[PDB]
Amino acid sequence: LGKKLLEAARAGQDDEVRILLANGADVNTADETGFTPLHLAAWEGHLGIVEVLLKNGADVNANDERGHTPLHLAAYTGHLEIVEVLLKNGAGVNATDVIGTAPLHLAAMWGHLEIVEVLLKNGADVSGNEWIWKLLLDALKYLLLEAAREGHRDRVEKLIKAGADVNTADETGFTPLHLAAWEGHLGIVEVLLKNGADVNANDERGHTPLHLAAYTGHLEIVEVLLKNGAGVNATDVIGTAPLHLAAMWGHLEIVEVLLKHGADVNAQDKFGKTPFDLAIDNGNEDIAEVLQKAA
C-alpha cells in the first residue's frame, strides 16, 4: 500500500491516492532514501496530490536523506502554485539541505525567478560556499532589472533590501536607473539614487540616465538626476548632450533646468550643431530664443 501510494502520487492519480488514504495508507510513507508522496508530487508538479496529501496530515517539512523538503523539490522544478500551497501549509522557507542550499537557491539553478521572489516575500533569509551566495545575488540582479523597467516602487525596494546590486546592467548597458528614467518611473529613480546608483552610468552608446530623461521629456526625472550630480554636459558617441536633446524635441522646461545647472550652450555635436542650431532646425523658436539669450 505504501509503494502504491508513492507511485500514485508520482503519477498524479488523485482519486487513486484518495482511495489509498481512505484505506489506511500512511500519508508519510517513505521510499528507501526518505522521499514521501508529498516529495514526489511536488517534484512532479501534481498540485492536486499535494493538496490531498496535506489535507490528510502529510508532514509539509519531511526531509529525505539529503535534507530536501517538498519545498526544495518544488522550487528546483519550478512549480510555483505548489510552492505557494506548501508555504501556506507551514513549509519552512529557510530549510537547508546537507550542502547548505535552501529552496531559493535551487529555484535559481534553472532561473525560476518568480519562485525566488515569492520565497523572499515569505521570509527567505538574506542575512568557499560563496557559490550559494552568488546564486542569490545573480537572481536579485535579474529581478532588479525586470522590476526597474516595470515601475513598481515596492518591488524594487524589496529587491534592493534583499541585496540586489543597483549598479548592474543588461547586455546593452542599461542599468536599473537607465530603465527607470527610460520608462518615466520617478519613484524608482529616487529609490535607486538613495541606495548608491551611479547617476552617470553610460550605456554602450554613451547615454546616461540624464540623456534618457531629456530624450523622453520627463522633467521631474531630469530635475532629480540633476540634484544628484547628473552630468549636464555629458555627450553620447555622436556628440549629443542633454541640451541638444531637449532642444531637438521641443522640451522648453527641460532646457531651462539644464541651463540653470550649468549646461554649455556652445557645445557642438559631431556635426557642429549647437542646441540653438537644432532648435532652429526643428522650428522651436521659443527654445531658440532662450538659448540665444543665454549665449
Author numbering: 14 to 140, 157 to 324
Please give sentences taken from the publication describing this entry.
In the context of DARPin-β-lactamase fusions, we observed that the paratope of this DARPin has a high propensity to form major crystal contacts, leading to crystal formation under a wide variety of conditions. Indeed, constructs D12_Hxx_D12 with H02, H09, H11, H13 and H15 yielded diffraction-quality crystals in space groups P212121, P6122, P212121, C2 and P1, respectively, at resolutions ranging from 1.8 Å to 3.5 Å. The observed pseudo-torsion angle of 172° is close to the predicted angle of −176°, but the connecting module is partially disordered, such that the C-terminal DARPin is rotated 90° around its long axis. In this orientation, all four D12 units engage in paratope-paratope interactions, where two DARPin domains form an antiparallel dimer. Two such dimers pack into a barrel-like unit. The purple molecule in Fig. 5b shows the C-terminal DARPin packing against the green N-terminal DARPin, the pink molecule the N-terminal DARPin packing against the green C-terminal DARPin. Only a few structures show a kinked, disordered or dissociated shared helix (e.g. D12_H09_D12), but even then the DARPins stay fully intact, demonstrating that local perturbations of the structure in the helix region can be accommodated without unfolding the DARPin moieties. Occasionally, the DARPin fusion constructs would rather distort the conformation of the connector module than forgo the formation of such favorable crystal contacts.
